[PDB]
Structure formats: structure tokens, C-alpha cells
Protein: Nucleoporin NUP53
Organism: Chaetomium thermophilum
Amino acid sequence: GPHMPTEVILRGYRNAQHQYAAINHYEQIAGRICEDYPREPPVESRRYKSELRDPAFTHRRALTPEERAKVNRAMSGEHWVKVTFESAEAADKAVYSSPQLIQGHLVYAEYYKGVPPAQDEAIPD
């Protein structure tokens, strides 16, 4: 069925330096995450961050209007991040798979319900 971008909270990782691992792992197991967050550890620099979208400056995937609207609703804390899966099916896989063990922490995936998590906290396994 037609892809409808679907927002999910990923939460419980050790600290903000572990956000990349939550995103990489859940993207790999569930499907594309539309945000341009890092998927590599911040142990050393890898890539320049740019918010340009002009194709004279980037040939990275152009977001659809529906994807862009949700990606622009950026939300995160120290131990959580809101992501936009490209489809409802991907979001459902993430939620079914939750929690996942990521660098010694249980990282939960929950549908976004209009509010941030009440607690911004790590969940050591």
C-alpha cells in the first residue's frame, strides 16, 4: 500500500552520543527513517552537516512534502529521539520489535502520540 510517513519515539539509550545506534539499528530492522541524523558513532568526524536542499548542492534523497512536514517536526532529548519512518508498515515493525538491546540499553520504539516522553532517561539492560 502507499507509503504514509509515520512518527515513532525511540527512547532509552545511554546518552545523546548513542542516538546514532538507535537510529541505525531500528532503520536496519524496520525500514527507512527519513531524517538525516547520523547513523555512525561520534568517535571521530565523518561528514559535514548541511541543511541545504538545492540540488546544486546535494543529490541526497528529496523528501516528499508529507515526509518533509514530519521531518521538520524535530524532537529529541538526551535519551530519546522522534523519527519519521517512511511507512506505517515500517513503524509497525519497529514497535513490534521493541525493545531492542543497543549498547547495553533497552531502546523502545513507541508510536508518537503528540507529546514527548514524560521521562528523558536511559534504560540499562
User: Anything to note?
Assistant: Strands lie at 6-11, 80-85, 100-102, 105-111. The longest strand covers residues 105-111.
